[PDB]
Design a protein around this ligand. Sequence first.
Ligand SMILES: [Mg+2]
Ligand SMILES: [Mg+2]
Ligand SMILES: [Mg+2]
Ligand SMILES: [Mg+2]
Ligand SMILES: [Mg+2]
Ligand SMILES: [Mg+2]
Ligand SMILES: [Mg+2]
Ligand SMILES: [Mg+2]
Ligand SMILES: [Mg+2]
Ligand SMILES: [Mg+2]
Ligand SMILES: [Mg+2]
Ligand SMILES: [Mg+2]
Ligand SMILES: [Mg+2]
Ligand SMILES: [Mg+2]
Ligand SMILES: [Mg+2]
Ligand SMILES: [Mg+2]
Ligand SMILES: [Mg+2]
Ligand SMILES: [Mg+2]
Ligand SMILES: [Mg+2]
Ligand SMILES: [Mg+2]
Lengths: 95, 288, 250
Amino acid sequence: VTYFSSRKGKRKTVKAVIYRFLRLHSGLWLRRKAGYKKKLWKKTAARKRRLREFVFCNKTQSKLLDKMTTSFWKRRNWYADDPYQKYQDRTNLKV
Amino acid sequence: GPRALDLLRALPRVSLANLKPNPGSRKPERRPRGRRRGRKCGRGHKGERQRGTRPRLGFEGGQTPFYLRIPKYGFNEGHSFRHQYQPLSLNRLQYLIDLGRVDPTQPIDLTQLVNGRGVTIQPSKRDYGVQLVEEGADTFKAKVNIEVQMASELAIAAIEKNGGVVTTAFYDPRSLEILCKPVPFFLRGQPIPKRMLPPEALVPYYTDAKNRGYLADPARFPEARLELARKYGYVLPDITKDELFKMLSTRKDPRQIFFGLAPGWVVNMADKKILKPTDENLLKYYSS
Amino acid sequence: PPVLRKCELPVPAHRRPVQAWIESLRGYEQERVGLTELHPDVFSTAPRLDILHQVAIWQKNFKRISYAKTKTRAEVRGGGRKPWVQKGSGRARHGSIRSPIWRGGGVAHGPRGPTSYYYMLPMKVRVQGLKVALTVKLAQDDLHIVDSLELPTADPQYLIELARYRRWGDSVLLVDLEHEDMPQNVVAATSGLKTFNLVPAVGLNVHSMLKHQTLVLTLPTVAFLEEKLLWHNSRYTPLYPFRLPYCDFP
RNA sequence: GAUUACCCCUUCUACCUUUUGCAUAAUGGUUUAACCAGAAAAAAUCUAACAAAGAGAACUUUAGCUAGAUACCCCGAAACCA
Ligand SMILES: [Mg+2]
Ligand SMILES: [Mg+2]
Ligand SMILES: [Mg+2]
Ligand SMILES: [Mg+2]
Ligand SMILES: [Mg+2]
Ligand SMILES: [Mg+2]
Ligand SMILES: [Mg+2]
Ligand SMILES: [Mg+2]
Ligand SMILES: [Mg+2]
Ligand SMILES: [Mg+2]
Ligand SMILES: [Mg+2]
Ligand SMILES: [Mg+2]
Ligand SMILES: [Mg+2]
Ligand SMILES: [Mg+2]
Ligand SMILES: [Mg+2]
Ligand SMILES: [Mg+2]
Ligand SMILES: [Mg+2]
Ligand SMILES: [Mg+2]
Ligand SMILES: [Mg+2]
Ligand SMILES: [Mg+2]
């Protein structure tokens, strides 16, 4: 992470985080499961199903991924047809 | 009013000499001096941490980093190029009309929504305009003429049941910038630009009467509209026999950015006068 | 005839206005020439020493630019060389003799470059600060509304004696509507004094209001301030800079 | 600690650093003076402004925004390059 850039003096973003993850507006980060394209003929139907699925990251991670991302990716987004738009709000959460 | 004034009568003159910041408004700043904060200064003992050189953020200590194990996938893919539509609930609309920010009297478009601060559009962020969602569907009483960028069935249904007229329009990014902030545009001293046609993927959207797109054949409007009245079971009001019919009828030219203005004119705000060119080539260029 | 001043802006339904004596500056003895109705929102605002403090400090610090530079270990004159070799000498090991430990060396941290302290308080905070200052002035009896402001003579002794006979306290600030429209005698007489002070209404501010024990306003000045300040309760959030064209606002 | 009384009695392993553990016979310093080492505001908390909006332009908004305040050292190689 670059905390102050050379030319603009701003705070840079790590792009390798932007390619594998997704930030919902609740703050949950959403990631693929490692090795899902890898050696399928070995694995059971069960394991294949477990691998195709998307999953959520623990607090320690979401926190870390947040530090590597600027304000622009924490933004509220309305896309036409957005699949995940139905998932971006949190409901019935009594902490 | 504030009985504090009566207390101020008996107290000494407020001056620079007595001024107290709010309690706990300033938090005291701590310095590494003395017995407590000195001597290792909260930096711990030796290691890399007390020299201050410990590694960068993602670093896991050399096992493959968490963020670098996971395969990549299109997620944020093309995020720069997906159009975005700022939502507008019928709640919000009914609300703006009710408190009388937007007036239903004159025809209601994007500009007048911006002026009412009901909706904030940022063309720069790949935002293509307002869309219509049905949140206030039952509550909605107003007789309105709306032009949005994208609309939903239930929204159109509601506005019909109340006897208003909806129309879908497309603006390109530049036109949208000009449409949302007209005054900072006129102070540029540029002519008034041509409006773009929708790109190829959107075109099938704006030719449908079901959508009530602005590029659609008006001849289907009396048809499909009536269809909408069957599905949600309301009787369709007669627009022709209405008193406000001359306002509802008002459309824009598909090439026009503004109501009653024309592509290629130039607004001089100092002399409060509008300038139009007589040049043949120029007039052909703008009229097309 | 007694000059009576009615408020030109709507008062809140639940709140009766405030009143102040209108004094004339021409007679020693003419204490109450008239009666002024003052707007309860500008002058009667719930007093907050808090916002007075915040803006009082802001005024002091937003202007501030410190030029204090100290040469760091890199910028000092010379000595880019090792004074003696690492091992074998018997003394402590050193790099450049310009290290911060050394006698002529660079300063380790110290003040760096010209520094600017600049922060912009949100508008409505500055506005309500101004209101509170006026309110405080009024509710402590140290505000005096004047009309005219024509002086009988240009002699400063007149102004000092006029302070004494009315018991105005030690220092005094005077506020006039415009800079061009200031009457002659006043300009001269005040421009000859330290403790008295003279300012256009465009230049009212909190720090100066607190710096003088007694504030004095012209009547058209009250008509001015009351309007400008009251305008911010009812405003929208700005779209572009207010200097540009708006429907109602110039 | 005390004593009429300086001692005489009685009670106590210099100080830092470093370590599992230092009176250590581990490191450092004759002594005095003057110099000689914690900097950042993403997220957060705290105090206020105005609030379905807020910011003195561009932004962010499912109670939010805007402002203030809270934060991250000093001395040392052998080297390498023109
Ligand atoms: Mg300590
Ligand atoms: Mg140490
Ligand atoms: Mg260690
Ligand atoms: Mg937006
Ligand atoms: Mg050098
Ligand atoms: Mg060298
Ligand atoms: Mg060196
Ligand atoms: Mg020097
Ligand atoms: Mg021992
Ligand atoms: Mg030591
Ligand atoms: Mg040992
Ligand atoms: Mg030993
Ligand atoms: Mg030894
Ligand atoms: Mg050793
Ligand atoms: Mg020794
Ligand atoms: Mg500090
Ligand atoms: Mg912050
Ligand atoms: Mg809050
Ligand atoms: Mg090399
Ligand atoms: Mg090397």
